[PDB]
Amino acid sequence: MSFLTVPYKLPVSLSVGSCVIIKGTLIDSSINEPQLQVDFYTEMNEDSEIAFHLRVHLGRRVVMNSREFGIWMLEENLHYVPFEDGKPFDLRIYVCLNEYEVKVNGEYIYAFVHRIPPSYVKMIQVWRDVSLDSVLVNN
């Protein structure tokens, strides 16, 4: 079947114990835009708060942040970038009580402490030049 059309938006309801599972392929095809971006919004509106932001600059960093009252807050940077041009990835984001646990290809890579309660997230958007197989939320 066909890759999901990006930018891809999905209405969701997150609780503690939820898991967002994103499977796709990144490619080295942009000048200074990230190759993958995942934003968790508090409304089905792109001006609303971003409880959780993850983006991938291949060979450089994975960056996580939040956008609260229009302001991009403290960037948390990983220099472990388990993403590779043209290889399929398995990105799992688990909702725990105090943090999202970010897991890639079966590896625990980062715990991002909640800045907005995850129960306020209403919409997930996955975009940048990603070839997206699936996005789904398990309870």
Short mmCIF file of N, CA, C and O in Angstrom, two decimals:
data_model
loop_
_atom_site.label_atom_id
_atom_site.label_comp_id
_atom_site.label_asym_id
_atom_site.label_seq_id
_atom_site.Cartn_x
_atom_site.Cartn_y
_atom_site.Cartn_z
N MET A 1 0.82 -1.21 0.00
CA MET A 1 0.00 0.00 0.00
C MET A 1 0.86 1.26 0.00
O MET A 1 2.07 1.19 0.23
N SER A 2 0.22 2.41 -0.24
CA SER A 2 0.92 3.67 -0.46
C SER A 2 1.38 4.31 0.84
O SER A 2 0.74 4.15 1.89
N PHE A 3 2.48 5.05 0.77
CA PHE A 3 2.93 5.82 1.92
C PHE A 3 1.88 6.86 2.29
O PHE A 3 1.19 7.41 1.42
N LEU A 4 1.77 7.15 3.59
CA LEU A 4 0.85 8.19 4.02
C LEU A 4 1.26 9.53 3.42
O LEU A 4 2.45 9.83 3.26
N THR A 5 0.26 10.34 3.05
CA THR A 5 0.52 11.67 2.54
C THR A 5 1.00 12.58 3.66
O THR A 5 0.32 12.71 4.69
N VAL A 6 2.14 13.24 3.46
CA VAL A 6 2.66 14.15 4.48
C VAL A 6 2.51 15.59 4.02
O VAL A 6 2.58 15.86 2.81
N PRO A 7 2.28 16.57 4.93
CA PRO A 7 2.22 16.42 6.39
C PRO A 7 1.03 15.59 6.83
O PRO A 7 -0.05 15.80 6.29
N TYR A 8 1.22 14.67 7.77
CA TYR A 8 0.18 13.73 8.20
C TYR A 8 -0.32 14.11 9.58
O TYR A 8 0.46 14.20 10.53
N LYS A 9 -1.63 14.33 9.71
CA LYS A 9 -2.24 14.73 10.96
C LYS A 9 -3.14 13.61 11.47
O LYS A 9 -3.83 12.95 10.68
N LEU A 10 -3.15 13.41 12.77
CA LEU A 10 -3.95 12.36 13.37
C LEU A 10 -4.57 12.82 14.69
O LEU A 10 -3.84 13.14 15.62
N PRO A 11 -5.91 12.86 14.81
CA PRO A 11 -6.52 13.11 16.12
C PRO A 11 -6.24 11.94 17.04
O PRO A 11 -6.33 10.78 16.62
N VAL A 12 -5.88 12.25 18.30
CA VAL A 12 -5.50 11.24 19.28
C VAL A 12 -6.01 11.63 20.67
O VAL A 12 -6.35 12.79 20.94
N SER A 13 -6.04 10.64 21.55
CA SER A 13 -6.20 10.85 22.98
C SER A 13 -5.13 10.02 23.67
O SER A 13 -5.06 8.81 23.47
N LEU A 14 -4.23 10.70 24.37
CA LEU A 14 -3.11 10.06 25.07
C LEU A 14 -3.42 9.94 26.57
O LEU A 14 -3.90 10.89 27.17
N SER A 15 -3.14 8.77 27.12
CA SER A 15 -3.15 8.59 28.58
C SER A 15 -1.79 8.04 29.01
O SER A 15 -1.01 7.63 28.17
N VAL A 16 -1.59 7.92 30.31
CA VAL A 16 -0.40 7.19 30.80
C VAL A 16 -0.54 5.74 30.28
O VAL A 16 -1.62 5.18 30.34
N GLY A 17 0.53 5.16 29.78
CA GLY A 17 0.46 3.85 29.19
C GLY A 17 0.27 3.84 27.69
O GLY A 17 0.51 2.81 27.06
N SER A 18 -0.16 4.96 27.10
CA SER A 18 -0.29 5.04 25.65
C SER A 18 1.07 4.90 24.98
O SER A 18 2.12 5.17 25.56
N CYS A 19 1.02 4.51 23.70
CA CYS A 19 2.21 4.42 22.87
C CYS A 19 1.89 4.91 21.47
O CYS A 19 0.95 4.43 20.84
N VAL A 20 2.70 5.85 20.97
CA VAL A 20 2.62 6.30 19.59
C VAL A 20 3.70 5.60 18.79
O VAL A 20 4.89 5.72 19.12
N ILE A 21 3.30 4.89 17.74
CA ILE A 21 4.20 4.07 16.95
C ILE A 21 4.24 4.64 15.54
O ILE A 21 3.21 4.69 14.84
N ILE A 22 5.42 5.09 15.12
CA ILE A 22 5.62 5.73 13.82
C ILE A 22 6.66 4.92 13.08
O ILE A 22 7.78 4.73 13.58
N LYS A 23 6.30 4.42 11.91
CA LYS A 23 7.22 3.66 11.08
C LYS A 23 7.34 4.32 9.71
O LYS A 23 6.32 4.63 9.08
N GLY A 24 8.57 4.54 9.26
CA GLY A 24 8.78 5.13 7.96
C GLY A 24 10.22 5.01 7.53
O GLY A 24 10.97 4.19 8.06
N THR A 25 10.60 5.84 6.56
CA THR A 25 11.98 5.95 6.08
C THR A 25 12.34 7.42 5.90
O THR A 25 11.58 8.16 5.28
N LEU A 26 13.49 7.84 6.43
CA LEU A 26 14.02 9.18 6.18
C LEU A 26 14.95 9.15 4.99
O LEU A 26 15.58 8.12 4.70
N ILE A 27 15.08 10.29 4.32
CA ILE A 27 16.11 10.45 3.30
C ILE A 27 16.80 11.79 3.45
O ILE A 27 16.21 12.78 3.89
N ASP A 28 18.07 11.81 3.05
CA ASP A 28 18.88 13.02 2.96
C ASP A 28 18.45 13.78 1.71
O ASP A 28 19.04 13.63 0.64
N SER A 29 17.39 14.62 1.84
CA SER A 29 16.90 15.36 0.69
C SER A 29 16.55 16.82 0.99
O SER A 29 15.75 17.41 0.27
N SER A 30 17.11 17.43 2.04
CA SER A 30 16.76 18.83 2.29
C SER A 30 17.98 19.58 2.80
O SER A 30 18.86 19.00 3.44
N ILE A 31 17.97 20.89 2.55
CA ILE A 31 19.15 21.71 2.72
C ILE A 31 19.40 21.96 4.20
O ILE A 31 20.42 21.51 4.74
N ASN A 32 18.49 22.68 4.87
CA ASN A 32 18.67 22.86 6.31
C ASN A 32 17.37 22.71 7.09
O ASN A 32 17.26 23.22 8.20
N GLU A 33 16.37 21.99 6.53
CA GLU A 33 15.19 21.50 7.23
C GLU A 33 15.46 20.11 7.81
O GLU A 33 16.23 19.33 7.24
N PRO A 34 14.87 19.77 8.96
CA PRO A 34 14.99 18.39 9.44
C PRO A 34 14.37 17.41 8.46
O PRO A 34 13.51 17.77 7.64
N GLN A 35 14.81 16.16 8.54
CA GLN A 35 14.32 15.11 7.65
C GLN A 35 13.08 14.41 8.19
O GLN A 35 12.44 13.64 7.45
N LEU A 36 12.75 14.63 9.46
CA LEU A 36 11.57 14.08 10.12
C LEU A 36 11.19 15.03 11.23
O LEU A 36 12.07 15.53 11.94
N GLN A 37 9.89 15.29 11.38
CA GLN A 37 9.40 16.09 12.50
C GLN A 37 8.11 15.52 13.03
O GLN A 37 7.21 15.18 12.25
N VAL A 38 8.01 15.41 14.36
CA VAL A 38 6.81 14.93 15.04
C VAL A 38 6.41 15.97 16.07
O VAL A 38 7.20 16.30 16.96
N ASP A 39 5.20 16.50 15.96
CA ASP A 39 4.69 17.47 16.92
C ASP A 39 3.39 16.94 17.53
O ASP A 39 2.51 16.46 16.81
N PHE A 40 3.28 17.04 18.86
CA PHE A 40 2.05 16.73 19.60
C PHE A 40 1.35 18.03 19.97
O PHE A 40 1.86 18.78 20.81
N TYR A 41 0.18 18.29 19.39
CA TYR A 41 -0.58 19.52 19.58
C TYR A 41 -1.70 19.36 20.62
O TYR A 41 -2.29 18.29 20.75
N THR A 42 -2.00 20.45 21.34
CA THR A 42 -3.09 20.43 22.32
C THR A 42 -4.46 20.75 21.72
O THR A 42 -5.47 20.62 22.42
N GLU A 43 -4.51 21.19 20.47
CA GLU A 43 -5.75 21.37 19.73
C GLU A 43 -5.51 20.95 18.30
O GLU A 43 -4.36 20.82 17.85
N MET A 44 -6.60 20.75 17.56
CA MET A 44 -6.48 20.41 16.14
C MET A 44 -6.30 21.68 15.32
O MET A 44 -7.06 22.01 14.42
N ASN A 45 -5.22 22.39 15.68
CA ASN A 45 -4.91 23.73 15.18
C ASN A 45 -3.42 23.93 15.37
O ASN A 45 -2.91 23.76 16.47
N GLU A 46 -2.73 24.30 14.29
CA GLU A 46 -1.28 24.40 14.31
C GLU A 46 -0.75 25.63 15.06
O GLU A 46 0.47 25.73 15.23
N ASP A 47 -1.60 26.55 15.50
CA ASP A 47 -1.17 27.61 16.41
C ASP A 47 -1.31 27.22 17.88
O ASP A 47 -0.91 28.00 18.75
N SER A 48 -1.87 26.05 18.19
CA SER A 48 -2.05 25.64 19.58
C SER A 48 -0.71 25.19 20.17
O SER A 48 0.33 25.23 19.50
N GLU A 49 -0.71 24.78 21.45
CA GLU A 49 0.53 24.40 22.11
C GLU A 49 1.06 23.09 21.54
O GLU A 49 0.31 22.19 21.16
N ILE A 50 2.38 22.97 21.54
CA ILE A 50 3.03 21.72 21.17
C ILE A 50 3.57 21.11 22.46
O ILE A 50 4.59 21.56 22.99
N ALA A 51 2.87 20.11 22.99
CA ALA A 51 3.34 19.41 24.18
C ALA A 51 4.67 18.71 23.95
O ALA A 51 5.47 18.59 24.87
N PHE A 52 4.90 18.21 22.74
CA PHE A 52 6.10 17.43 22.50
C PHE A 52 6.49 17.59 21.05
O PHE A 52 5.66 17.41 20.15
N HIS A 53 7.75 17.93 20.83
CA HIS A 53 8.29 18.14 19.50
C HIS A 53 9.54 17.29 19.40
O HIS A 53 10.37 17.29 20.33
N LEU A 54 9.65 16.52 18.32
CA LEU A 54 10.86 15.77 18.01
C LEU A 54 11.20 16.00 16.55
O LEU A 54 10.32 15.96 15.69
N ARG A 55 12.49 16.24 16.27
CA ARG A 55 12.95 16.40 14.90
C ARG A 55 14.34 15.82 14.77
O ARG A 55 15.08 15.69 15.75
N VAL A 56 14.69 15.48 13.53
CA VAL A 56 15.87 14.68 13.22
C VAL A 56 16.65 15.39 12.15
O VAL A 56 16.14 15.60 11.04
N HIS A 57 17.89 15.77 12.48
CA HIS A 57 18.88 16.24 11.51
C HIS A 57 19.89 15.11 11.37
O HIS A 57 20.74 14.91 12.25
N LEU A 58 19.78 14.35 10.27
CA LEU A 58 20.64 13.19 10.06
C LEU A 58 22.11 13.58 10.20
O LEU A 58 22.54 14.61 9.69
N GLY A 59 22.86 12.75 10.93
CA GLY A 59 24.27 12.96 11.15
C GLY A 59 24.62 14.05 12.14
O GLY A 59 25.82 14.29 12.37
N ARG A 60 23.62 14.72 12.72
CA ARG A 60 23.85 15.86 13.60
C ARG A 60 23.19 15.62 14.96
O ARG A 60 23.90 15.40 15.95
N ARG A 61 21.87 15.63 15.04
CA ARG A 61 21.21 15.52 16.34
C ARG A 61 19.76 15.11 16.15
O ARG A 61 19.18 15.25 15.07
N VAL A 62 19.20 14.57 17.22
CA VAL A 62 17.76 14.51 17.44
C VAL A 62 17.46 15.58 18.48
O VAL A 62 18.14 15.67 19.51
N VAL A 63 16.48 16.43 18.18
CA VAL A 63 16.11 17.55 19.03
C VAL A 63 14.68 17.35 19.50
O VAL A 63 13.79 17.06 18.69
N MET A 64 14.45 17.52 20.80
CA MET A 64 13.12 17.55 21.37
C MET A 64 12.87 18.89 22.05
O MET A 64 13.79 19.51 22.58
N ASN A 65 11.62 19.34 22.01
CA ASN A 65 11.27 20.62 22.62
C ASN A 65 9.76 20.68 22.85
O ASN A 65 9.04 19.70 22.64
N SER A 66 9.29 21.84 23.31
CA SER A 66 7.87 22.15 23.39
C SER A 66 7.69 23.59 22.95
O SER A 66 8.64 24.37 22.94
N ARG A 67 6.48 23.93 22.55
CA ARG A 67 6.14 25.30 22.17
C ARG A 67 4.93 25.69 23.00
O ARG A 67 3.81 25.21 22.76
N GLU A 68 5.16 26.51 24.01
CA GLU A 68 4.15 26.88 24.98
C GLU A 68 3.97 28.38 24.92
O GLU A 68 4.94 29.13 25.06
N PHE A 69 2.72 28.80 24.71
CA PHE A 69 2.37 30.20 24.50
C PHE A 69 3.18 30.78 23.35
O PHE A 69 3.67 31.91 23.41
N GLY A 70 3.33 29.98 22.30
CA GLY A 70 4.02 30.41 21.10
C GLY A 70 5.53 30.40 21.18
O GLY A 70 6.18 30.71 20.18
N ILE A 71 6.11 30.05 22.32
CA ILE A 71 7.55 30.13 22.54
C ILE A 71 8.12 28.72 22.51
O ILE A 71 7.63 27.83 23.22
N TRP A 72 9.16 28.52 21.70
CA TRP A 72 9.92 27.27 21.73
C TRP A 72 10.77 27.24 23.00
O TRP A 72 11.58 28.15 23.23
N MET A 73 10.59 26.21 23.83
CA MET A 73 11.21 26.23 25.16
C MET A 73 12.62 25.65 25.13
O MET A 73 13.36 25.84 24.16
N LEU A 74 13.00 24.92 26.18
CA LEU A 74 14.36 24.40 26.30
C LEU A 74 14.56 23.23 25.33
O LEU A 74 13.85 22.22 25.40
N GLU A 75 15.51 23.37 24.42
CA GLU A 75 15.83 22.28 23.50
C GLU A 75 16.63 21.22 24.24
O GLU A 75 17.60 21.54 24.93
N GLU A 76 16.22 19.96 24.09
CA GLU A 76 16.99 18.82 24.58
C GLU A 76 17.55 18.07 23.37
O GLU A 76 16.80 17.63 22.49
N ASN A 77 18.87 17.97 23.31
CA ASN A 77 19.59 17.48 22.14
C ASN A 77 20.22 16.12 22.42
O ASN A 77 20.81 15.90 23.48
N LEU A 78 20.08 15.21 21.46
CA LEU A 78 20.75 13.92 21.47
C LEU A 78 21.76 13.90 20.34
O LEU A 78 21.41 14.25 19.20
N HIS A 79 22.98 13.48 20.62
CA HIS A 79 23.94 13.25 19.54
C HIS A 79 24.02 11.78 19.15
O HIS A 79 24.85 11.42 18.32
N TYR A 80 23.15 10.95 19.71
CA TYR A 80 22.93 9.59 19.23
C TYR A 80 21.76 9.65 18.25
O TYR A 80 20.62 9.87 18.66
N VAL A 81 22.06 9.52 16.96
CA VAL A 81 21.05 9.65 15.91
C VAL A 81 20.86 8.30 15.23
O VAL A 81 21.48 8.02 14.19
N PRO A 82 19.97 7.47 15.75
CA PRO A 82 19.77 6.12 15.19
C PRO A 82 18.99 6.10 13.89
O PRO A 82 18.40 5.07 13.55
N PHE A 83 18.98 7.20 13.15
CA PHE A 83 18.25 7.31 11.90
C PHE A 83 19.25 7.35 10.75
O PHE A 83 20.29 8.02 10.83
N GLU A 84 18.94 6.66 9.66
CA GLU A 84 19.87 6.54 8.53
C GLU A 84 19.13 6.77 7.23
O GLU A 84 18.04 6.23 7.01
N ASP A 85 19.73 7.59 6.36
CA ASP A 85 19.22 7.85 5.02
C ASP A 85 18.80 6.56 4.32
O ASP A 85 19.64 5.69 4.06
N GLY A 86 17.51 6.42 4.03
CA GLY A 86 17.01 5.30 3.26
C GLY A 86 16.78 4.01 4.03
O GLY A 86 16.40 3.01 3.40
N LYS A 87 17.01 3.99 5.34
CA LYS A 87 16.71 2.79 6.11
C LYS A 87 15.40 2.95 6.88
O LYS A 87 15.11 4.05 7.38
N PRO A 88 14.60 1.90 6.97
CA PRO A 88 13.35 2.01 7.73
C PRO A 88 13.63 2.15 9.22
O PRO A 88 14.57 1.56 9.75
N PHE A 89 12.82 2.97 9.88
CA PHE A 89 12.93 3.17 11.32
C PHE A 89 11.62 2.80 12.01
O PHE A 89 10.55 2.74 11.39
N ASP A 90 11.73 2.55 13.30
CA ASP A 90 10.60 2.21 14.16
C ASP A 90 10.67 3.14 15.37
O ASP A 90 11.44 2.88 16.30
N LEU A 91 9.89 4.22 15.36
CA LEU A 91 9.91 5.22 16.41
C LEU A 91 8.72 5.01 17.33
O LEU A 91 7.57 5.13 16.89
N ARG A 92 8.99 4.69 18.59
CA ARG A 92 7.95 4.49 19.59
C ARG A 92 8.11 5.54 20.68
O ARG A 92 9.21 5.75 21.19
N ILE A 93 7.01 6.19 21.02
CA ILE A 93 6.97 7.23 22.03
C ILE A 93 5.93 6.78 23.05
O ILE A 93 4.74 6.73 22.74
N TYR A 94 6.39 6.44 24.25
CA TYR A 94 5.54 5.90 25.31
C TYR A 94 5.20 6.99 26.31
O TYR A 94 6.07 7.74 26.73
N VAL A 95 3.94 7.05 26.72
CA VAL A 95 3.49 8.06 27.67
C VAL A 95 3.58 7.47 29.08
O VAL A 95 2.78 6.61 29.45
N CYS A 96 4.56 7.91 29.86
CA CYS A 96 4.67 7.53 31.25
C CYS A 96 4.13 8.67 32.10
O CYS A 96 3.68 9.69 31.59
N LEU A 97 4.15 8.48 33.42
CA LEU A 97 3.54 9.47 34.31
C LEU A 97 4.32 10.79 34.28
O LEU A 97 3.72 11.87 34.32
N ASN A 98 5.63 10.72 34.20
CA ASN A 98 6.48 11.89 34.33
C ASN A 98 7.22 12.26 33.06
O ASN A 98 7.74 13.37 32.96
N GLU A 99 7.24 11.37 32.06
CA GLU A 99 8.07 11.54 30.88
C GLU A 99 7.44 10.78 29.72
O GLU A 99 6.68 9.84 29.93
N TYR A 100 7.75 11.23 28.50
CA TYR A 100 7.72 10.33 27.35
C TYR A 100 9.05 9.60 27.29
O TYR A 100 10.12 10.20 27.45
N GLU A 101 9.00 8.29 27.07
CA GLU A 101 10.18 7.51 26.73
C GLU A 101 10.20 7.36 25.21
O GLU A 101 9.24 6.88 24.62
N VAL A 102 11.28 7.82 24.59
CA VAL A 102 11.45 7.81 23.14
C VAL A 102 12.33 6.62 22.80
O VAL A 102 13.46 6.50 23.31
N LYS A 103 11.81 5.73 21.96
CA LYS A 103 12.47 4.47 21.61
C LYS A 103 12.58 4.37 20.11
O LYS A 103 11.61 4.63 19.40
N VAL A 104 13.76 4.01 19.60
CA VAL A 104 13.98 3.91 18.16
C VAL A 104 14.61 2.55 17.85
O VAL A 104 15.67 2.23 18.40
N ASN A 105 13.98 1.79 16.97
CA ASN A 105 14.50 0.49 16.54
C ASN A 105 14.82 -0.40 17.73
O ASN A 105 15.85 -1.07 17.77
N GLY A 106 13.93 -0.42 18.71
CA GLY A 106 14.15 -1.31 19.85
C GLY A 106 15.16 -0.83 20.86
O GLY A 106 15.62 -1.63 21.68
N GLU A 107 15.51 0.46 20.83
CA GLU A 107 16.49 1.04 21.73
C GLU A 107 15.87 2.21 22.47
O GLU A 107 15.27 3.08 21.85
N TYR A 108 16.04 2.22 23.79
CA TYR A 108 15.64 3.35 24.62
C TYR A 108 16.68 4.45 24.46
O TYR A 108 17.85 4.24 24.78
N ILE A 109 16.30 5.62 23.93
CA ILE A 109 17.28 6.67 23.72
C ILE A 109 17.05 7.92 24.56
O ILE A 109 18.02 8.65 24.81
N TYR A 110 15.83 8.20 25.04
CA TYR A 110 15.66 9.46 25.77
C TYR A 110 14.35 9.49 26.55
O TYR A 110 13.32 8.98 26.08
N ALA A 111 14.38 10.14 27.71
CA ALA A 111 13.20 10.39 28.53
C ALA A 111 12.95 11.89 28.62
O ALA A 111 13.73 12.62 29.24
N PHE A 112 11.86 12.35 28.02
CA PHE A 112 11.55 13.77 27.91
C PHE A 112 10.47 14.11 28.93
O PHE A 112 9.32 13.68 28.78
N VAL A 113 10.83 14.84 29.98
CA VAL A 113 9.90 15.13 31.06
C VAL A 113 8.74 15.98 30.54
O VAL A 113 8.93 16.93 29.78
N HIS A 114 7.53 15.64 30.99
CA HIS A 114 6.32 16.35 30.57
C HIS A 114 6.36 17.81 30.97
O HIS A 114 6.54 18.14 32.15
N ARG A 115 6.16 18.69 30.00
CA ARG A 115 5.95 20.11 30.23
C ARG A 115 4.49 20.51 30.16
O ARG A 115 4.09 21.49 30.78
N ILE A 116 3.71 19.80 29.37
CA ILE A 116 2.26 19.93 29.37
C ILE A 116 1.75 18.52 29.63
O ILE A 116 2.24 17.57 29.00
N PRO A 117 0.81 18.34 30.56
CA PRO A 117 0.21 17.02 30.75
C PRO A 117 -0.17 16.39 29.43
O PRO A 117 -0.82 17.04 28.59
N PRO A 118 0.23 15.14 29.18
CA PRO A 118 -0.09 14.50 27.89
C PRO A 118 -1.58 14.31 27.66
O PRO A 118 -1.98 14.03 26.52
N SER A 119 -2.41 14.44 28.70
CA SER A 119 -3.84 14.28 28.52
C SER A 119 -4.46 15.44 27.75
O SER A 119 -5.62 15.36 27.35
N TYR A 120 -3.71 16.51 27.55
CA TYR A 120 -4.16 17.65 26.78
C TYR A 120 -3.86 17.52 25.29
O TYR A 120 -4.33 18.35 24.53
N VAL A 121 -3.09 16.52 24.87
CA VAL A 121 -2.76 16.38 23.46
C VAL A 121 -3.99 15.91 22.70
O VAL A 121 -4.67 14.95 23.10
N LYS A 122 -4.31 16.59 21.60
CA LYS A 122 -5.44 16.22 20.78
C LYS A 122 -5.07 15.81 19.36
O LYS A 122 -5.88 15.16 18.69
N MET A 123 -3.87 16.16 18.89
CA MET A 123 -3.52 15.93 17.50
C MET A 123 -2.02 15.71 17.39
O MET A 123 -1.24 16.41 18.02
N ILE A 124 -1.64 14.73 16.58
CA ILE A 124 -0.25 14.47 16.23
C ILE A 124 -0.05 14.80 14.76
O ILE A 124 -0.89 14.48 13.92
N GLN A 125 1.07 15.47 14.45
CA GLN A 125 1.44 15.75 13.07
C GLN A 125 2.83 15.22 12.82
O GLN A 125 3.76 15.51 13.58
N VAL A 126 2.98 14.46 11.73
CA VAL A 126 4.27 13.90 11.32
C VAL A 126 4.55 14.42 9.92
O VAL A 126 3.73 14.23 9.01
N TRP A 127 5.69 15.08 9.73
CA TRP A 127 5.96 15.73 8.45
C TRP A 127 7.47 15.82 8.23
O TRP A 127 8.26 15.17 8.91
N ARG A 128 7.86 16.66 7.25
CA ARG A 128 9.16 16.68 6.57
C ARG A 128 9.21 15.52 5.58
O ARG A 128 8.27 14.71 5.53
N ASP A 129 10.26 15.45 4.77
CA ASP A 129 10.24 14.58 3.59
C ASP A 129 10.44 13.12 4.00
O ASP A 129 11.40 12.44 3.63
N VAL A 130 9.49 12.63 4.77
CA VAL A 130 9.52 11.26 5.27
C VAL A 130 8.60 10.42 4.41
O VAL A 130 7.55 10.90 3.95
N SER A 131 8.99 9.17 4.16
CA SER A 131 8.11 8.19 3.54
C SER A 131 7.51 7.36 4.65
O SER A 131 8.15 6.46 5.20
N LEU A 132 6.25 7.66 4.96
CA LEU A 132 5.60 7.22 6.17
C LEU A 132 4.76 5.98 5.87
O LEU A 132 3.83 6.05 5.06
N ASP A 133 5.09 4.87 6.53
CA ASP A 133 4.29 3.65 6.43
C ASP A 133 3.03 3.73 7.30
O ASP A 133 1.91 3.54 6.80
N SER A 134 3.19 4.00 8.59
CA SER A 134 2.07 3.97 9.53
C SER A 134 2.32 4.94 10.68
O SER A 134 3.46 5.22 11.04
N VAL A 135 1.23 5.46 11.24
CA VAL A 135 1.24 6.16 12.52
C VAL A 135 0.07 5.62 13.31
O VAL A 135 -1.08 5.66 12.83
N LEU A 136 0.32 5.14 14.52
CA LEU A 136 -0.82 4.63 15.27
C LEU A 136 -0.58 4.77 16.76
O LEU A 136 0.57 4.81 17.22
N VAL A 137 -1.67 4.84 17.51
CA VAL A 137 -1.63 5.03 18.95
C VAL A 137 -2.27 3.82 19.59
O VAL A 137 -3.43 3.50 19.31
N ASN A 138 -1.49 3.12 20.40
CA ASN A 138 -1.94 1.98 21.20
C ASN A 138 -2.27 2.48 22.60
O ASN A 138 -1.67 3.45 23.08
N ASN A 139 -3.26 1.87 23.24
CA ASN A 139 -3.61 2.31 24.59
C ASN A 139 -2.67 1.67 25.61
O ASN A 139 -2.61 2.08 26.76
#
